[PDB]
Amino acid sequence: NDYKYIIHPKNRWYKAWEMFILVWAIYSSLFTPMEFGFFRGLPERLFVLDIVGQIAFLVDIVLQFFVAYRDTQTYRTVYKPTRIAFRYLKSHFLMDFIGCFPWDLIYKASGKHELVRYLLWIRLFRVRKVVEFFQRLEKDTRINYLFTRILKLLFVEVYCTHTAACIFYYLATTLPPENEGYTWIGSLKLGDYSYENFREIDLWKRYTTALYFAIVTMATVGYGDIHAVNLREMIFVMIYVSFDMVLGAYLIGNITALIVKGSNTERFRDKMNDLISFMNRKKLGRDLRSQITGHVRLQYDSHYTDTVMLQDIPASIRAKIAQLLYLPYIKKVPLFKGCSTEFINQIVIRLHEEYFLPGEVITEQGNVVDHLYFVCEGLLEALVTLLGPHTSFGDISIICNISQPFTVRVCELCHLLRLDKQSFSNILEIYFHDGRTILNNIMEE
Amino acid sequence: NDYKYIIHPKNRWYKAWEMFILVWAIYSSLFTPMEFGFFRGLPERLFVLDIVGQIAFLVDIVLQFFVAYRDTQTYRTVYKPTRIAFRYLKSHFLMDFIGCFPWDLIYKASGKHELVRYLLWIRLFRVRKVVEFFQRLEKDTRINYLFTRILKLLFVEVYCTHTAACIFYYLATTLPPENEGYTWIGSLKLGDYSYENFREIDLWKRYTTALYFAIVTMATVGYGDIHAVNLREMIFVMIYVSFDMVLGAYLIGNITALIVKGSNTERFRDKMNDLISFMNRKKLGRDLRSQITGHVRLQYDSHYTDTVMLQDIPASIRAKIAQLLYLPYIKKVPLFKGCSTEFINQIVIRLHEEYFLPGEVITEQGNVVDHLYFVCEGLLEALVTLLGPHTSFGDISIICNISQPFTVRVCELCHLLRLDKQSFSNILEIYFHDGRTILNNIME
Amino acid sequence: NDYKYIIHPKNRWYKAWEMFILVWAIYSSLFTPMEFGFFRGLPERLFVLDIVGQIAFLVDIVLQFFVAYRDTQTYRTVYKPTRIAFRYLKSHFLMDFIGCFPWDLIYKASGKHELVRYLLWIRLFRVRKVVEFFQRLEKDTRINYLFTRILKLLFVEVYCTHTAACIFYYLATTLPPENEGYTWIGSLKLGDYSYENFREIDLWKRYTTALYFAIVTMATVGYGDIHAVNLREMIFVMIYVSFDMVLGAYLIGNITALIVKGSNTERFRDKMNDLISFMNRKKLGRDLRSQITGHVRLQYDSHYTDTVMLQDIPASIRAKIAQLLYLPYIKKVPLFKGCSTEFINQIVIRLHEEYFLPGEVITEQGNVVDHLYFVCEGLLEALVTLLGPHTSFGDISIICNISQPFTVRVCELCHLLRLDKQSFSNILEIYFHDGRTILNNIMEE
Amino acid sequence: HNDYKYIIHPKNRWYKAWEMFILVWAIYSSLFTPMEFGFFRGLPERLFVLDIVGQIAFLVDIVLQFFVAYRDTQTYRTVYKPTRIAFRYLKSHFLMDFIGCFPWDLIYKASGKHELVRYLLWIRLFRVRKVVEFFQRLEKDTRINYLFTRILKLLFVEVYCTHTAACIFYYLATTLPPENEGYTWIGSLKLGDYSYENFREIDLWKRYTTALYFAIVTMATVGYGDIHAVNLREMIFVMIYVSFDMVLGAYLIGNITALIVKGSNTERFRDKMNDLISFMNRKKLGRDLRSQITGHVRLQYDSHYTDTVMLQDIPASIRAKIAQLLYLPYIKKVPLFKGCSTEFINQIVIRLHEEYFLPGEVITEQGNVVDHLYFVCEGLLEALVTLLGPHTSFGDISIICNISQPFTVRVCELCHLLRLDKQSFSNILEIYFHDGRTILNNIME
Ligand SMILES: [K+]
Ligand SMILES: [K+]
Ligand SMILES: [K+]
Ligand SMILES: [K+]
Predict the structure, then answer these.
(1) Is D137 labelled as part of a ligand binding site?
(2) Could you give a GO molecular-function term held by this entry (chain B)?
(3) How far apart are alpha carbons B209 and B224 in whole angstroms?
(4) Is residue B329 part of a domain?
(5) What's the Rg (C-alpha) of chain D?
(6) A221 C-alpha to center of ligand 2: Å?
(7) Is C220 on the interface with A (CB under 8 A)?
(8) Contacting partners of chain B (3+ CB pairs under 8 A)
(9) What is the domain extent for residue D329?
């Protein structure tokens, strides 16, 4: 569908309108409980700030009419400007068009009725754009999805305790200024400071005092210097600490569910509490068992080469991992100069990757060779000549019946491509002109 | 069906009676601690409410000598009259019959003794009609096990604080009204309000103060504006906060066991997170990386494909899978159709339903054949074919065993159906009748 | 055995004494902090109770030289009465002998020095008895074992607050009685009661006040009506809430571990979760989706066959449990069972435990028959023919090899055993004259 | 690669009394530093030389890091080179370690007493590296427990963050002048009959214990409310602090939970045993056969988990001799494996799996093609004909000529039997048909 206005929502200019209008949706939903609770009609040095705030969201409900709804199941950017304009208009339109009115001028214009000031809470449907941000961030593999299920709750508490702080102050102002000794704040004395005549206290002292109660209540510390006094602040504190009691168990739940999918050090000790067993009873040479612990400290703390995981995708396309990365490592070898792709593919059917810390001897001198080795990383030592990367060893003695003439020792941290020497008999006897290719580069010394 | 004055327990009138004594059992067990704690004899403008409250639970005792039950080990609904009158009468008769007696007129017409009034607590045995609700909601997939052990723990933790509010008020009234200053509420002063002469404060101020000190204690906030000053109140809030320590730990434990025991995203994100952590170890581009992003919706999509299949194997309901959606989807393919009952029930087994994201590469040209696909959903594009439903591909690559002659790429999220090729060569050449029935009709 | 007077530790007279000294070890370890904290040397009225409290532990001293030691390595009853005198004199002898001295008479006969009263805390090692009781309770597998770790944490939690109440009261008594206004209890005023001259407040008011502080501190409520005043009470409350912070996280952890390894209804409702999301996309049934969970509530939540856990035990001894239970149910079955030991041992592995709910039909007349079902108990209906226990059906499907002539309906939830037709092909052909001997009396009676 | 003389090897036993010497200087002067900032404005003269000798212990440690060969994590080399260990130090921890060693109390007292030259004391808290480079060397040490290192670096973080929150909370009371002192948390404090007025001349340890008492009661979320925040700058600190340790207490509960729901192998076995015992105790099987399954499924159970973990771990070129030291003296005393070469037994030892079985269980029967081929390590088995003792072999003629195995296996004492597939053995006798001819002759002789 051509439709040369309809923004596909990966456009880079529809991302200076999703982290622009997300900053506005954080301001406009952190300020709206403060505008409801701590003011009755905004002071007129906040008139431009309340006018231009609702313009940025007003030119955002025209940019929902020209945006590409990628469909719910049949994945398709539905470019049709009568089904994006009718998907929006009955999902969230009049919770974005209602909370865009100048509810502070409607309040003051209509004779200052208090009930027309409760429609500020329709502007809390802009934290939607912060929960359509912790949903487009768990769909991002560079961090854990369950870590974002903790960071979602740690914005939720901290938005519920700012909103609770702003409703708890508001409930003090619903009694007349002469009945303020029967409120939580007009009857407060902290230190030598009396919070009498609290409506003329500085805004940030009143906000910080109301937020102090709500945070030491959310944490369930609850000192009791600030407490409910009324019968209507008791009902709010009862609702709020019942909401927190569930919300604080949910936080502990998510942190525990993160930790039960544990870390690599306790996964190392998971693989090693049993490797104290079996080798105490049926013990090996504890020099080589110390290097076994070394190779477990090398599979852990380092590369998790996923031969433990590549069984998920099928064998011919996990041999395609052995195609688009192994045509580098196998064609780079000077032993296979002049070898066609089929021999390469049948060799990389049966390849393995192992790693070697310095200290081993890999193919021992004076004894039979067991495997093919190609060098990816690190650097080796043959004792006489130093055999580095993209090179062959173990391989000058399986083409004939010879032994390994070098104590091929490992000097840097290596990345051996190890293959069974059974394979370099079957692949070598089925393909004959390939066998003579290896024969003539053997005679190319 | 032998007696006809028994009631089948799923009769749709006796499901609108059980929802009628569930709003009385919620009322009469929330009201009963307020009948005990906050009054000494119920007032005169509450007489007709206390009478007609205990009538609804009195035509529930004559209506349960008539109700058929389904046995616990015999597992058949029992309709025997002189057997239901000995199951009800062994379990729930007297705790239903005692708490019906008019214990406010029995209190008042016996010279107002206080011990005739602790028999109101027999009516808290009516909360069993609320645990019989959250225990029949348990067994409901229709209404999720999204939160049942954890909602019935949030009812029992606002029912035990409504009751503790009423016992905590009642212990204030056991000291005479001249020892009010040695009481949690007679010595209370909140703001400029003094709760003195506290028996003459209106009921909802007393009740809301007592509930404030049950909920602030249950949440373990514990401000300290209201606290126990007495020895009997000290003993009560010791018992209560021990019970709450255990109950709050149990609530936290149930929520974290619901969150630990995760299924759907705990088979999905743990795939691609580790897989991109391995492909950013050794770089694999994006085309095959997106194709393996499609592959984690080939081995995880469609109910984890062939792992949950292998449980309803004693019950012969794989006939329904094997002829009710697979063989319709098979009769939705051209030659693969198989077109004969034996062969189609033979190849109906080894299939895999496969979800591919758009933009993907499905089968390249010059590529060795490896799998066979039945398309029923999605839309595919070949590089020559605008593939909608059931015009599926991979047909002429198997007998003419050469590379697939087309490069198909998908444009909207598709739902392929996979068989292995080595199946449909072996039982291909086994069925020579269907061998001819396959290789006669090639698209002319 | 060979040594005469050595009581074996599993008698019925050293198990009435192990529970007699469990109520002297629950008394004398709950009373020992009350004797330390609340008295400066017991009253004369509490004299004989102390002496008989200590005399019941001298009897338990000498009855450890006469108890047969159950060894820890050799796993036997070491009757050697110098192998049971030793390990006692190396384990528990002295600390159960410096807790039997009369430390309230050898405190008052020494000038009443208050440092010999800290030898009362040697009597607190008699909660060995209470934790030994919770060690021979995990062995009792009749009740759960993580549940027996959350009652070994609600004894340890309400014993560490009884002790912390007595230490907290004790710390108020370490200041002189004229500096009592600088203690937590001498400066206490609850309601209109003043706790001044607190040493003459009677013992249960003082104890209940101290214990109320310790319990609302354990629960982390902390009203702060009673709080620490001194520096020594600050240090104690700091130690105690820090200790009780890891003891309360341990309780939550042990509760979670029990709930995670837990219920069989949420082991049933997640199976049916993706099964109903399965059948809402795979479309097996419209109301037999009830007959799906009519069988996920028949074989599951009840009749819990752990046959996948019988896959864990060996096939040999799984055939042996099939012998020892199945074959008395297998043999009381009609004539088409085989009437010989070889046949029933050759078929007994193949039969699967099945149940069926009433109102269900099994196999309609006029189809190929795939299985044979044999009733152990239960009531079946062939249609007009009532088949109770020992009245197994599935006879006429292979005997006179025509179609089945009945419709087996279920009249009571039964105990069928289902072998497949491959069983009554293999075992019926290798023993063929047994099958024709079965045919020799097919309802000829 | 020890070509560099004066470089200290990083595991030397004398540079390990300088990792446990500067860890007791790093524990002292990371605990003393918030006390030096918080409770003093410039140290007294009494604490002079303790200051000076505190910083010439971390000054010796600066030039003892240019002489220590670090060990790489990409080449895994101890880089013994002064030009290569210096530029690692100078770009990781040098400005956090050099200017944390300046005398920031002579730069305070001698720069005219400007505060803000005293906030540079806070970069001596970058010596808790040495305590988290300790809990990262204790956690790659399975020699020590995981209940001693896993929550124990959270019962350091929760007594380091409440020692430091106790010193900032006191410090904020000193930022108000000593006239506006009853508007602080401590100058307006009155506990008991003691008033903390004129608080700057209270002893250091009363002032420190009061602040730590607040901080620990707040960390535990008791919150008595006898000490609370009265300022607005102390309200903000308490709001930051109780929000920080609401996350940190949930992390402690999560760690203690995930250390319990990963309960070890013993209680996994007890779970196994209670469900196994109960499953045939509610149907009431014989206790003798339940004890038979006990005596068998137990060696079978531990054999199962240890054999699968020894096979799936230990990658190739090191697994081979482990398996050979497991198996070859037990399979070379074998009349079937005689005469063949050594590379064949190198291939054999990997595909071997040991097992454990009972005196009385059977492996295969009369009607049977085997699932495996077996050789003997332990056992007293029988073929029903041949009473096979130790160092024996069975399943051999069913390999080559594909005939059914006529002998039921009767094991008479607890064995150590050797699992090898028929499929893999046929695969490697396809490979070693040079040895396969000896195997055909070995079954035929
Ligand atoms: K408090
Ligand atoms: K708390
Ligand atoms: K609290
Ligand atoms: K509190």
Answers:
(1) no
(2) outward rectifier potassium channel activity
(3) 13
(4) yes
(5) 35
(6) 5
(7) yes
(8) A, C, D
(9) 315-444
